Structure 1
Amino acid sequence: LHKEPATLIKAIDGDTVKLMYKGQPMTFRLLLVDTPETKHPKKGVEKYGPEASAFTKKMKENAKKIEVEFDKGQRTDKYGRGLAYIYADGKMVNEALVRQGLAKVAYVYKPNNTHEQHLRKSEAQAKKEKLNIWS
């Protein structure tokens, strides 16, 4: 796997962002995580939804460098969103959210699970500390 630069266009929510990738505006969906929904009516504004978005937003807006890291499988989901591990100044946003109890490790679709254990460990740590989602 390798990191590729991307430029923030707009953070949509905690796990979905619009990035300029290879001079192309693209919506990216954070691999292996699920931040609470703030959009979809069928889900409603979920607890920590807002917090997860602010977090991603903040992390990404304050970053000097944004990098996208595709996994070994599909790079896009059925919605056409790029599936990556996104890094803000070398910090994986996916993990950052999980570690904070702002996302749960979800949608682990092999073989796009390269950092699953990593994220799982951070999630365990967040549950362990009863952070946000786990509080």
Structure 2
Amino acid sequence: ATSTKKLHKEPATLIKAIDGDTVKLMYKGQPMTFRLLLVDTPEFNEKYGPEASAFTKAMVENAKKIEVEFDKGQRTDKYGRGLAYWYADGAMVNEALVRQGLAAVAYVYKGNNTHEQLLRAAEAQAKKEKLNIWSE
């Protein structure tokens, strides 16, 4: 089975920050746009959008080391974007954004949701504290 298999972190280098949930990284020596697994962030024209983008930008740009961790299902979406959990010096970007109430758990599929419970826990706490998107 694959449900109990482990995930592995891989090195990547920041090329440029994009927005709340996408980033341009050099992976295996090639440029790629990565999308955060299991989340949905407000866009630039939406409330908390500029905040989410700023949060992710700072987290990735100030990271000494960036790593990507693909899940066990789809590694690239229909738009050619890499689907992964990103880590900035050991801290998961997907989790951090949700914990601050700057993103919501979304796009949770099959065997591509290894960190679902972890993220839902962060969302519950962000909602309890009425942080950002949960203050409405």
**Normalization by structure 2: what TM-score?**
0.92
Deviation at 1:47, TM superposition (A): 1.0
User: Which protein is bigger by CA-based radius of gyration?
Assistant: 2
In 1, Cα distance between the equivalents of 2:30 and 2:64? 19
Deviation at 1:18, TM superposition (A): 0.6
Q: Deviations over 1:75-121 (max 9, x none)?
A: 01100000000000000000000000000001001111000000000
Q: Structure 1 unaligned runs (5+)?
A: 38-45
Q: Deviations over 1:11-50 (max 9, x none)?
A: 111101110000010000000011111xxxxxxxx11111
Q: Deviations over 1:110-135 (max 9, x none)?
A: 11100000000000000010001101
Count of residue correspondences: 127
Q: Identical aligned pairs, as a percentage? A: 93
**3-state SS in 1 of match to 2:75:** coil
Look up the match of 2:32: 26
Q: CA RMSD in A?
A: 0.5
**Normalization by structure 1: what TM-score?**
0.93
In 2, Cα distance between the equivalents of 1:35 and 1:17? 13
Look up the match of 2:51: 51
Deviation at 1:74, TM superposition (A): 0.5
